[model samples]
Target: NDPVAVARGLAEKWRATAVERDRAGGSATAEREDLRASGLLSLLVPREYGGWGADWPTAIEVVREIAAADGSLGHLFGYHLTNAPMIELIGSQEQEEHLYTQIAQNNWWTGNASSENNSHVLDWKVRATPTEDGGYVLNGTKHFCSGAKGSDLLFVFGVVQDDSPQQGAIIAAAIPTSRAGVTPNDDWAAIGMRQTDSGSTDFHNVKVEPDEVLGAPNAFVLAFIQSERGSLFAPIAQLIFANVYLGIAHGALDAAREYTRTQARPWTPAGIQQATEDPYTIRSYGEFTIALQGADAAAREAAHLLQTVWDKGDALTPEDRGELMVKVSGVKALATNAALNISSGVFEVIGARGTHPRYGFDRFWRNVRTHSLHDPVSYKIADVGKHTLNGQYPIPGFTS
Candidate 1:
C-alpha cells in the first residue's frame, strides 16, 4: 500500500465531484478517512517512532498530488503533517520525543490552537489557569482549526491571565481531544475550501496535564523564535501553500482541457468549428503549461532545500536557515502567481459555458484565492527581491 499511488488514485476518483461535496456542506470526514486508509498521515513523522520517516520533498509531492484532487483535502492532510510536530519545534527535546512517539503509536491527528478573529496566533488570547495539582485549565476560542473537528490530539498556545509565576506568560500544551471541555464548533461557512471544516474550537477550562506541556511556560516563545527549527516553519508552511495552489492550477487546467475537447465551440468570428483547434485556445493552454513547469520546478527546489536542512536537523545555523527561507519565499511567490493565473485564466479557454455550476470549474479559483490570503504574496516578492539584491535574509515571523 504505497501511500503515493493511493493518494494519486484518490485524487483522480475525487477530482470530478469535489465541488458537489463542498456545496452540500460535507464535513472533512471523506478526506480524513482517505488519509487514514492510505497511511499518508504519518509521512513526516520519524520512522523510529512508527512514522513513515519520509523527507520534506516526498511529503510536499504527496501533498500536491492530493491537492490536485481537492484543495481542502490537501490543506487538511498537509496541515496535520506540519502541525503535529510543533512539539519538536517549540518544546524541549524530552517533550519532542515523548510526543512524537505518542502521536505515531496512537495514530493521532494534531491540530493547533492558533487563529482567531481580530488577532494573530502570537496575540495569546487563550488563557491558562494553574490549579493546586500543578495542572492547568485552558479557556478560549480558536478559529480556523483545519483538522480539529475530528482529531485525536491538539497543541494549544495560551497565556496565564492575572496570576502568579506564570502571569501573562505564554503556555503551550498537547492534550487529547477526548479530554473534557474541548468542543469543536461547526462554524466554517467560507465560499471556498468549505470541506476543510476550518472552524473554531472552544476550550472551556480544558485540563492540561503537566507532561503534556511543551517545556515550561514562556520559555517556548524565545527558543522557538530563535531556533533553526523555528525557521523551518516558514518553508514548511510556504511550500505547502505552493503545492496546494499548484494542485488547484492542475485541477483548473484539467477542467479546461476536458471542456475544450468535448464541449467548447469556437467563436463565430474565429471561423473554426472546434475550440481545441483554435490557435488562440491552443496557445492559452500552452501558456498555462509553460507557467506550471516553472512553478513545479521552483516547488521541487524549495522542497529539496527543506529536505537537506531537515536532514541537517539541529546542526543547521540560523543564517543558513534564513538563506533557505529566501528560496522558499521565491517558490511560494511563483507558485501563488501560477495558481491565480491558471485557475482564473483557464476559464478564458473554456469560454462562457465553463462558469456553469455543473462544471464546478470555479472551485479551483475560489479555493486558491481563499487560501493564498493566508499570507500575502506581495511581501513574499519583496522578501525574495531583498535577498537577491541586498543579499539579506527575511526576518522570521508569521508571514516569513
Candidate 2:
C-alpha cells in the first residue's frame, strides 16, 4: 500500500464530514486513530527502526493529500512529521535509537509544546530545575501546543535553572503526555484550524531524565542546535506550512469546480447555458489553477533541496542552510498568497448561493486565513528580497 494513496483514500472519507467536523470544533480523536491504523505515523522514522523512512517529498505529499480533506488534520499531521525528526537532528545517538524505536514500534503520535511568549528567543516560560541524577525537573506552561489532545509524546523546550555561565541555554526534551502534572488545556479558540488541538499545556514539576535531554551538555545554546542541520529544521517546518496552505487551495478549487458543475446556475446577462461556461468563472479558475501550480512547484523544489541538505548529515554547512532558508521562505510566501486568493476567490466563482452554511465552502478560507497569520508572509518575502539584493541571509532566529 503506497502511503500517498492511503492518504488520498483517507482524504476522500474525511472530506465528507469535514464541514460538520469543523462546525462541531474539537479534537479529531477518531481521525487520529485512523491515521495511526494507516501505518503512516512512522512514515519518517528510519527503516532500521521498523519504519518506512520515506523521503521528504513523499512525506509532505502525504501531508498535502490529507490537508486537501481538512486543513486542521493536515496541520496536525504535518507538524507531527516536523517534530518527529528532532531527536535524530539534535538528540544523542542513544536517545535517537531509543526514542525512534519506541515511536516506530508503538505508532506513537507526537506534538510540540515549545513555543513561549517572550521577547527573547532564549527566554522560556517553562524551566527545568537540576535534579540529583544530572537530570532536570520541568515546570511551566507552553502555548500553542498543537496535536496535544491525542498525542502520545510531546517535544518540550525550556531552559535549565542554572545561575552559572550555562544559564539561558535552552533544552529540548521528549516527554510523555501521561506524566504526572502534565495537563492539556484543550482551549484552542481560534476562528480557524479549530481541530488542531492547539491549546495551552501545563507542566508541573515533570521529571526529565538525563537521556531524554537532547544534544551534548556544552552543545546547548539560546536555541536548539547540534550542527548546521539544526538550522534546516526551521525551514522544514515552514515548508510543511506551505504544503498545508497549498492543500487548502487544492481543496477549495476542487469543491468549487464540483459545485459550479452540478449546482451553480448561470448568472444573468452572462449569455451562458451553464455556470461553468461563465467567462468570469472560467477565468477565475484558470488564474487560481495557475497560481496553485506555481505554489506547488515552489514547495516541491524547496522540499527537494531540503532532502539534499538533510542527506549531507554532519557535513552540512551554514551556507547550505541559509540558501534553503531563502528558498523555503519564498515558497511559504507564494503558497500563502495562492491559498488566500483561491480560498476566497471560490466564493466569487460559485456565487452567493454557494455561501450557504450547509455547503461549508468558507472553511477553506478560514483555515488558511487563521494559520497564515501564525507567521507573517511580509517578513518571509522581505527575507527573499533582502537575500537577492545584498546576499545577506536572514538571521537564523527562532522562526527564521
lDDT of 1 by residue, 69-117 (tens): 8888888878888786677776778877777787777777777765342
For every model shown, the clashing-pair count is 0, 0
Cα misplacement distance, residue 332 of candidate 1 (Å):
1.3
lDDT of 2 by residue, 220-313 (tens): 2422343366666778889999999999899999999999999999976757887888888889999999999898988999999999999998
RMSD of 2: 1.7
Top-scoring candidate (TM-score): 2
Q: How many angstroms is residue 99 displaced in model 1 relative to the true structure, after the best TM-score fit?
A: 3.2
Cα misplacement distance, residue 337 of candidate 1 (Å): 1.1
Query: What TM-score does each of the candidates earn?
Result: 0.93, 0.96
Residue 343 lDDT (model 1): 90
